[PDB]
Design a protein that fits this description.
DNA binding, binds thymidine, Arc Repressor Mutant, subunit A, four-stranded antiparallel β-sheet, alpha+beta, dna binding protein, DNA-binding, binds the ligand *O[C@H]1C[C@H](n2cnc3c(N)ncnc32)O[C@@H]1CO
DNA sequence: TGAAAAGGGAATTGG
DNA sequence: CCAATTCCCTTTTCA
């Protein structure tokens, strides 16, 4: 009996779709899947991610961005050439 | 002028 | 052994 936990891209996509923590992350170009983190309030979302996963240490945005870097391999999220800006693969977005 | 932002290697670990 | 987590290292920017 192995318990399921959220993946980072799901956590973030759920935040965006529901308009939660809109002070910490927001759509920049929603039709294109492009979103961006708040420069001042991103660590609050980071801590919320750590709690969500029940990790032993406090989650910081450095460790969160470090995690996002690995998605370059599988392609669910890529970094965009804009400050604290990222992009979801379009197969995660409606038509 | 140092915090922030951007990369990175790799050992680790819950499940 | 995935899917991050954790820790540490770098360079570049600019507020
Ligand atoms: O101690 C040096 C460096 C520091 N300082 C702060 N902001 C600076 C900019 N924009 N250019 C150069 N030096 C900067 O103050 C002293 C120089 O005035
Ligand atoms: O492919 C490897 C790793 C895999 N493995 C090992 C262990 C200890 C575990 O808990 N899960 C798991 O999938 O088994 C193969 C042999 O070690």
């Amino acid at each position: 009996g192995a318990r399921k936990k959220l993946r980072l891209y799901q956590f973030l996509l759920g935040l965006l779709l529901r308009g939660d923590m809109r002070e910490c992350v927001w759509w920049v170009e929603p039709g294109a899947g492009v979103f961006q983190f708040s420069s001042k309030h991103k660590e609050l979302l980071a801590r919320r991610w750590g709690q969500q996963k029940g990790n032993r240490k406090r989650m910081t945005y450095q460790k969160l961005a470090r995690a996002l870097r690995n998605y370059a391999k599988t392609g669910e999220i890529r970094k965009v050439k804009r400050k604290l800006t990222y992009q979801f693969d379009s197969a995660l977005l409606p038509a």
